[PDB]
């Protein structure tokens, strides 16, 4: 129950503009660690870590 990795399924086609924030879960046992909190509906969804915009969004946040 509380032992299952939190992200069982992911969303593939979430857009940067519709994200309040990304949560990056500290779950190294687990395949999927990226969660989006969505602007339109306030849902939290797990997202595809290969989504191209994610890498740029996080790089930006690192103020490099």
UniProtKB/Swiss-Prot annotation:
Changing residue 23 to E: Impaired CXCR4 activation. Loss of integrin activation. Changing residue 12 to A: No effect on anti-HIV-1 and chemotactic activities. Residues 4-8 are annotated as: Receptor and heparin binding. The lineage of its organism: Eukaryota, Metazoa, Chordata, Craniata, Vertebrata. Changing residue 16 to A: No effect on CXCR4 activation. Changing residue 21 to R: No effect on CXCR4 activation. Impaired dimer formation, leading to increased chemotactic activity. Eliminates the pH dependence of dimerization. Changing residue 37 to Q: Slightly impaired CXCR4 activation and clear resistance to inhibition by heparin. It comes from Homo sapiens (Human). Changing residue 45 to A: Impaired CXCR4 activation. It comes from the Eukaryota. The chain holds residues 26 to 89 of 93 of the full protein. This is SDF-1-alpha(3-67). The record marks 20, 23, 39 as: Important for integrin interaction and activation. Changing residue 10 to A: No effect on anti-HIV-1 and chemotactic activities. Slightly impaired chemotactic activity and no effect on inhibition by heparin.
